[PDB]
Subunit: 258 residues, 3 copies
């Protein structure tokens, strides 16, 4: 009954949105696998604040597993005995060990590369064929094919920019064997350098049939998400003013198998 | 007996009879006013029928409707309330998971151009028969969306919504049959691949030659005939139309549109068929 | 297993057969999609020591010609070969599904973009000849597959069938690797299979081979309409020391004609979880 505000990072609104969803997910007592553990701070968060029973994970970069280990031992010293990462270079979960560990997990979590992520920030062309790569989420769909096969009973909890709308995000789960549920969302502001052509091209794109398409992306003018904008609209306000403040939603969605 | 003004629905119903729904639990996606619910209950002798529609005002009407249509069996009709897109609600999924068979005539490119007008007139006919004098808008609606089904592989032949329902059925009812109605202009091979690609063995249960209204646009199907493949290599493809009500003289989409570029009332036919998908 | 057994006339089939031997089919019950004239059946019974080989073909005449070829080439094993009859597209008959569902391993060298340009004329001449004795896959229904974007749509269509009909069976497939192994592996990972590359060779491509489809791959913009980095894998030498894009390969030949262009063929096994 006391929100752990001190815990969520004050720096990155994407990671903050993720961590708040992880807290809501209810990871207490579960085995959890994180795709792309990075520096390990999410693992530390899930161990210390969420109270996961066990956490494993992997990264594409082999040096990151070892560095994640220090961090977890520094930041969650009295819970670090429960962090068992998988070394070494692991794209998605594509090694036998990563597969074994995913196979034993109750929840798979991640914030994966996706069109629309922040610039500041996997191999990439082999995911181009995925149907949901048409909205920039191929890599995310690639993981859902793997999780459904290796751990068919586990939840999958993923972080998304929601410029394409929640009907599409929910579709990515429904198309792949999972009932989706939005755990948490937030309005976030994007850098002034962010490119969004991709998003204007989306609403200007003919279907695929192809016939029609009066669809519109989701942006906001205020940090409260009061004033909706299309991608074209938004793209305008920046042609008007290069330092115009543009907002979109980031949200955490859990897919639960049947 | 069947209404011959709506051949897609005749086709649908005739297909359902053949399905073998005697004593089974069935879910219908898009129950409408319950015409198909009552049919299965009265003619097919189903033990239980449930289902939903994306218009939330419809279940109530249907219920009523089925009561009047099959009162001696309307107690086995158990609709699910709410604005149910496909089977997207816990309660909807729950019922689907308990069903032996899932049936639908779903939106799809090539459905009759007047399908949304017929539904509006059927909704308002059913409310008048229930003793209510209403506002017309009570029977209109903004359903079904389309953008989230656009990325589906089989949306390229206009069946994205149908594919999406198959992703759903397979996961929440992996042993259930799925019985679906389609316009076959794209070819029965393509219709069969829709099922095969999604874990189902297809069987064509019944089919019929029907005529398309004169003002029906078929440039979509023409556009498929001139398209290249995903490869960018030449694609060989032909749509299936007919010049005769019997389905004896075949026409591609390009030919069919020629006969209405020269004349303007040339009778143009195509197939409508019921396909059952059965999992292994 | 002796060198003489592997096909000395055809690098694609030689690659397939070296890969099947490495798959360890001994004692297994196997199913081949596209048996053709049955030589691979003979190779799997006689060299791989399979307990039982079934399979089918789209051309309904080939199962009968494959029986005679297996009777004449592995007479001591011929009783272990039980082809499925009739025209069979992939495995799409109740008898082919029933056999596939009893199989330990499903194998195939399936039609695919990048196959040798003369394979369809071979199969045609090969029919006719073998047809005495005495007396193709369309590609339109498979065009929707995501992996058709790389020309592997028929292969993906099989993976959807095997997974449903024989969920515990391995699946062993021969591929040209011009689109790279990450893509080939992703075809399996996307469809419920863990890929392992069993064997691979560097083959020479016929002289007038059209590689325009692969050039186009290197210049396409993805599904998102933005940039994409991608090079097909070709080689200038028969050991693959010197790499080449499809564009480099095409250019090497625009200025020659008889330039030697090489690429990889490789056998991948897809194992369920």
């Amino acid at each position: 009954p006391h929100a752990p505000e001190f815990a969520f990072d004050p720096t990155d609104p994407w990671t903050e949105t993720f961590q708040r969803g992880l807290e809501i997910a209810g990871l207490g007592g579960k085995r959890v696998y994180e795709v792309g553990i990075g520096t390990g701070i999410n693992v530390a968060f899930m161990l210390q604040i969420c109270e996961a029973a066990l956490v494993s994970g992997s990264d594409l970069d082999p040096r990151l597993a070892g560095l994640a280990e220090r961090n977890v031992r520094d930041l969650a010293p009295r819970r670090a005995d429960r962090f068992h990462p998988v070394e070494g270079a692991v794209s998605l979960i594509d090694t036998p060990e990563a597969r074994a560990q995913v196979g034993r997990s109750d929840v798979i979590v991640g914030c994966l590369p996706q069109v629309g992520e922040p610039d500041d920030v996997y191999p990439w062309a082999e995911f181009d064929s995925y149907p949901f790569n048409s909205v920039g989420l191929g890599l995310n769909e690639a993981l859902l094919r793997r999780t459904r096969a290796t751990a068919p009973a586990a939840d999958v909890v993923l972080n998304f920019g929601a410029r394409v709308g929640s009907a599409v995000l929910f579709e990515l789960f429904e198309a792949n064997g999972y009932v989706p549920e939005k755990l948490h969302s937030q309005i976030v502001l994007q850098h002034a350098g962010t490119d969004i052509s991709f998003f204007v091209a989306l609403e200007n794109a003919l279907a695929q049939t192809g016939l029609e398409r009066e669809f519109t992306c989701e942006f906001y003018g205020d940090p409260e998400g009061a004033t909706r904008l299309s991608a074209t609209e938004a793209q305008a306000l920046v042609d008007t003013d290069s330092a115009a403040e543009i907002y979109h939603e980031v949200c955490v969605i859990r897919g639960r198998p049947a």
